[model samples]
Target: ITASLVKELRERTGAGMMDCKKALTEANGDIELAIENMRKSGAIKAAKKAGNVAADGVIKTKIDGNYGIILEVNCQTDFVAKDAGFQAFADKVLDAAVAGKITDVEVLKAQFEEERVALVAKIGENINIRRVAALEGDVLGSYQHGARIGVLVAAKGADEELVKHIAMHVAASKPEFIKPEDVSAEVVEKEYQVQLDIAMQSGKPKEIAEKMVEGRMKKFTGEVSLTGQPFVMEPSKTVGQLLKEHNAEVTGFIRFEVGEGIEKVETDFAAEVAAMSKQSKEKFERTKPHVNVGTIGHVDHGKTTLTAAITTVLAKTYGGTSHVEYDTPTRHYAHVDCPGHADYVKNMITGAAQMDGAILVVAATDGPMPQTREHILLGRQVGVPYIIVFLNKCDMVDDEELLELVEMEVRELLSQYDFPGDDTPIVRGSALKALEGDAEWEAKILELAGFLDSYIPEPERAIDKPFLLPIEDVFSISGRGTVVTGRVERGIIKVGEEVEIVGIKETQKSTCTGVEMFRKLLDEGRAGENVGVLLRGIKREEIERGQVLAKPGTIKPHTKFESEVYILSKDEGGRHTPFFKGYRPQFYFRTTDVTGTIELPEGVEMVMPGDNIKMVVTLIHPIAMDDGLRFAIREGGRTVGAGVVAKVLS
Candidate 1:
């Protein structure tokens, strides 16, 4: 072959000079024949590498000056994806698609099949033109996250920044559909079936389960639809809201994540499976079910003592520890003491304890006191599903008749509060006596522990409800503003969700930028886990323990509300004097206490202790409240009455 002919073949085929020269010699210096033989050899080389799995690659995105195009060019190894030649080949394929206005992946594949095979032959790894997508619209925006995710969004507005933000959101959120209606029927059916199974497992009625499934499916649709997701930059607003504000409409979008849906094997199959199993087990270990129990009772009624006694007894018996930490067959129990009327804000505010069940500790000699009723109201208000009575100071009562009378009075009080007072088991024991080495009292304490273990039903998990987290603690984290720590009362919260601080503050709306538990950062937080949520745009001073971090519009702030209130008696440590209308008292709800005027209903001239009546309360400042919420009204540091919101007035 001539030197010029050999050089021309080398330049055209990108083959080695020596190989090209030899091919030319074999072809008798015919340029076309030499090129054809090189391609045949390249095909053979490609076929050899084709059996190797290609799971790592880079995504290429282009605007084409108008239409948007995206390409996933995959290679057997990540190193090759970053290789200059592979990147250039990917770019070339995309440029071709742009220049030829190609949309079909098959067409682009056919056009680039020879180039791809040649690339595979040169790189010694499988190089695949996995997919190509192009979109045409009035305006187009594209984004590439790292080199793995590429997104192209077509819209109807010329607002470039808005379109770019939307495109970036698409890349971050990875939405599967443009809107709820765009979800395929098959997907909806599959999701509905899955959700139905979950709801049915909750043991709800079939109709209720169906309804729950529909609601979950709606959530699923919103989760997967672009328009329904909250905007990344402004989480308070959804992408749909941004579109409405900018008068921009996203016509369509195409997102390609490299190596998605590809089964990869970079190690021995058994070793990989073992590694996966270990990871899965670790995850399962972290998510095991846990129960939070709280102690509620009258002031100085040995609530904390009762808590310590149970834990001490359990510790000696079952190797459990302080605050009565123990495990049942299904879940673990963590006993939290809610000292009545003392640091009420610390204990009951923010619903911090979030007790699934409670132990009503009362001195047998004192029977049930004012704080006893108030604490029970608090228990019901904070959604405590059940209560077990631990009657302390039993040894102090010498008369058997008096002890039965105390039990009867306590049961009557529980029944009035809609609890199973008549049937609810009451374990009478002296925590003081038991802790002081009294064997008989200790046995009674053990009996109380047995009742606590068996009488209380398992609580409904918080994840199944709407998201609510009362801010138990607030911190100003460096580089992150306003981190509020609290147990999620209900529902699930993930990063990027829009939340509202709806309590004593001015109802601030902010985004959950981060959710952390202990020192580890998590992408999502479920109900019942104590988590610290970093709120974007909220200063530490703006949020406090009393405020609730809730899903927007779930719980409302109210200034006036009608409630069903019960006035405590003198025996129960309530006000001895009859109170007329317009009596002002401090109202405690959740973690916040606000002073408000108690206006008795007309014709009720005066309300006395031990009276149950419906009254309207007008607060000085708003608190997050809802119907069935419980509150305690104290005139002067002593809780005078307890009530539940029957209707919100404002």
Candidate 2:
């Protein structure tokens, strides 16, 4: 009934529009079921031209600051490679590779095969994203020769112009390694054996034959290594000598020439599609891996601004910036921001809004501030596996030395917090400029997002526990009823399951009618998936972001509990003053925040910071409570302590 669904099915299955619609109708609007039944019925035409010989196309290169990418997409003929539509598709493929930092051919294929298959259907040619190369360094440059050859170079102690010259040399010379030393021993041995046999065939003595082979090996190394080869522009000087004269070192270089080694075959165009259609085993799922990334920094460090800039750039709109889902070609990202110091512990440090990784925003002008250090510690405390530093406000800083200083300080702090200081990516950009529509800075923002996708690893799922989904966004559709969106904290949910909404005033029951991930409908949503569930007979206003949707009787709301608490030491960003009975702090559990009154146990008249003790806590409002749930207590606009539920009391 919806064009979106029809379009999705057609794109996924490579079926005709009418066939997709009929299948969708027959499958009762369940896309997954429709796909399974369609594939089972042998109706899908996806990858119809998969096995066709494709050996002609273009090589594209994109370079941004210290990062660069080179890729090749192949077509069946030189005529099709020159087609405008074919070139456009290849452009998109190269851009995707650059945006995702994708170097592996399989990853690029998994992300773009649908588009490729669609393009094949239209153009009647087999297409392939054959190869990709990515490089990063202090200096980077790239060169593309017409539509056939692409080269990317990474270097140190050189200007981009010099590196670009090296890239040109790589494109022309086609060196296999950066230096003779970089040539592997096995490869050298193989070459030496061939040379030794040739020398022995000359009927020379053993010592003379061996010496001849050694001299030939030296010549072979020079022919195959970038440093040993003579410069293309200056035949008199070896590339190594040219680089040495310039005081530059080429760290790495990748060269791609279209259809370099692929076997080409001429075929009747009419029979190719039909012959490949029967081999349907090439179907692959395009469900991208999802990651939850949080933005943590000083209040004025542009955490909110950076998130908004990313949303605007990727989504082309600036909706609610606090929590936005970016469904990029390579991965799905759930961006959550802890705006200030108070919300840091309440939302992120505790288990309320789980983050797989975090983006630490720091101003290039101010360097690492107090909250920057605090946020770093919180990331470690919450076990956020990695952090990507965004040195925002780069447009405001003109001094390169100051920027390096800022990076050094931030790296030092990250190392102190046991994070990957040396290797953690630091992307510099002005989010303000990105929001203001500056194209230069917008590219930098894209680089930061690319780092997020490439550098942040997917987290382990909590599928073993009973189903728990914290509602982060709620939507009301006129015909579809209410939809609640969030990542499944644990377990799984299927359509038509009975569930309870806990943590609000009273637990209410609802039936799940539909499950969807990133606008694509699914029969079930599993743990670690960001999903939108249709709740039958519920109003959007009735559900809020902090409430937990769970399996019936698995969780309950309770106002009182006894817990084991750890008070953060002052050095750990906690309070210096001591606290006694009648202390009040906001307790955050799961996604709900409740004001709680704390009472110290006997023999502990007062508890100082850094003390670990059992205490009784009474909440002003009941939140979904369970044994072993972690919670953080915040006071005086900072996180002072944290605790875990030992027992729940009425």
Top-scoring candidate (TM-score): 1
Tens-place lDDT per residue, model 2, 329-398, is 5677887766433334444424556688989988775566433555687687656889999998888764
Worst 10 residues of 2 by lDDT: 272-281
Q: How accurate is candidate 1 locally (lDDT)?
A: 0.74
Top candidate on lDDT is 2
Off by over 4 Å in 1: 1-39, 266-650
- The 0-to-1 C-alpha lDDT of every candidate, in the order given, reads 0.74, 0.75
lDDT of 1 by residue, 1-650 (tens): 36556545655534543456667668776889888888888888788777877777889887866777788988754545656678888889988888887878889888888888877655556778888878888888887766777788888864888887787788767788888889998867987887788889966899999987898788878989988998866668888888988888889998888788997543432232223221177776566567777766643455666666665665565564123455533457777655323223223332344566788877765565433455676666555788888888888765555556567878988888899988888987888777666779878877976676677766666677679887887898786577988888889889999999997768989999989988788988898788999889878878887789889999978999998777777898887555655688899876667889877777564465566677889988888888867888887678887777879985
* Model 1, residue 324: C-alpha shift (Å): 47
Which clashing pairs does model 2 show?
Answer: 352-590
